[PDB]
Amino acid sequence: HHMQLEIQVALNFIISYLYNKLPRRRVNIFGEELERLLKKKYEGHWYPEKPYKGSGFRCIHIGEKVDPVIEQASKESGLDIDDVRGNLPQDLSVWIDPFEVSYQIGEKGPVKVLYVD
Numbered sequence: 440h441h442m443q444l445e446i447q448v449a450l451n452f453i454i455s456y457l458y459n460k461l462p463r464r465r466v467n468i469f470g471e472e473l474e475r476l477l478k479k480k481y482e483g484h485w486y487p488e489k490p491y492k493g494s495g496f497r498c499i500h501i502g503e504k505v506d507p508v509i510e511q512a513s514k515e516s517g518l519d520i521d522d523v524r525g526n527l528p529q530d531l532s533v534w535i536d537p538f539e540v541s542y543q544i545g546e547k548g549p550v551k552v553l554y555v556d
């Protein structure tokens with residue numbers, strides 16, 4: 440029902456990797472904190488008019504370095520960011536733009552779409 444809905448889509452996707460190698464309730468906590476941090480980060484950086492404006496800011500990147508929002512959601516969930524990294528596909532990008540959520544795996548991977556309207 441917003442940028443909200445789209446952060447949900449990305450969240451669901453990301454944590455989907457984490458369940459069943461990381462403890463259930465603490466992955467739930469990881470999601471909830473992730474959701475909060477994205478909202479807090481994306482506030483005022485969301486322009487349905489120019490969806491691509493700030494797209495590179497909003498991008499969740501987990502290459503050889505981890506996006507702070509990921510690192511923060513880990514610390515606030517008691518999870519070792521190395522164990523979280525480990526269960527997430529390497530060189531992952533998730534772009535969350537108005538009307539579209541998409542992601543790439545691997546430097547030469549195709550972009551895939553989770554949500555578009």
Ligand SMILES: O=c1[nH]c2ccccc2n2cccc12
Nearest residue numbers: 493494495496498500532534
């Ligand atoms: O890995 C990146 N993907 C990306 C996708 C769309 C827009 C901007 C970016 N971007 C900006 C710094 C880094 C990245």
